[PDB]
Amino acid sequence: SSDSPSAPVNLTIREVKKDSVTLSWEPPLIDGGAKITNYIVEKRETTRKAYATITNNCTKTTFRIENLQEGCSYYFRVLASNEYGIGLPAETTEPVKVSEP
């Protein structure tokens, strides 16, 4: 059916620093019609409407988002992609505040 992938599994915030966040995830349970080729990582400030893509070419299952706004709260999304399209996102349930510990 040439389906796209399902959502990445168990998206985890691995690290939260002053203005960066490291995410990790497990591959989707459904690759669809073809193998996973790349992951798309996105951010959204709690005060913005639209998600901003950080990278569309993440090939590992972990990624560090940098140059965030210290003191700002964010949602993050990771989407899985195969040759046939982009799947549904895995998203952080709570917003993450980046700040110096």
Residue numbers in the entry: 2 to 102
Give verbatim lines from the article.
Fn3-3 and Fn3-11 are found in the non-repetitive region of A-band titin near the tip of the thick filament, Fn3-20 is in the second D-zone super-repeat and Fn3-49, Fn3-56, Fn3-85 and Fn3-90 are located in the 1st, 2nd, 6th and 7th C-zone super-repeats, respectively. We also characterised the effects of three further rare missense variants found in patients with HCM: Fn3-11 Ala16872Pro renders its domain unfolded (contrary to the predicted domain structure) but is still solubly expressed in bacteria, whilst Fn3-85 Ser27083Pro and Fn3-90 Arg27839Gln do not affect the folding of their domain but reduce its thermal stability. Although Fn3-85 Ser27083Pro and Fn3-90 Arg27839Gln have melting temperatures above physiological temperatures (47.0 °C and 46.8 °C, respectively) their unfolding curves show a proportion of protein unfolds below 37 °C, which may point to these mutations playing a role in disease. The disruption of this motif is likely what renders Fn3-90 Gly27849Val insoluble when expressed in bacteria, and unable to be refolded. The predicted structures of the three variant domains suggest they can in principle fold correctly, with a slight clash between Val27849 and Ser27766 in Fn3-90 Gly27849Val the only steric hindrance observed, but calculation of the change in Gibbs free energy due to the mutations suggests all three destabilise their domain.
Encoded by the gene TTN, titin spans half a sarcomere (the basic contractile unit of muscle) and has various functions including preventing sarcomere over-extension (Gautel and Djinović-Carugo, 2016), acting as a molecular ruler for thick filament formation and as a hub for numerous signalling molecules (Kruger and Linke, 2011, Linke and Hamdani, 2014). Fn3 domains are only found in the A-band region of titin, where they are arranged with Ig domains in a pattern termed super-repeats, which themselves are repeated. Fn3 domains have a characteristic beta sandwich fold, with a core of hydrophobic residues as the “filling” between two beta sheets that pack against each other face-to-face.
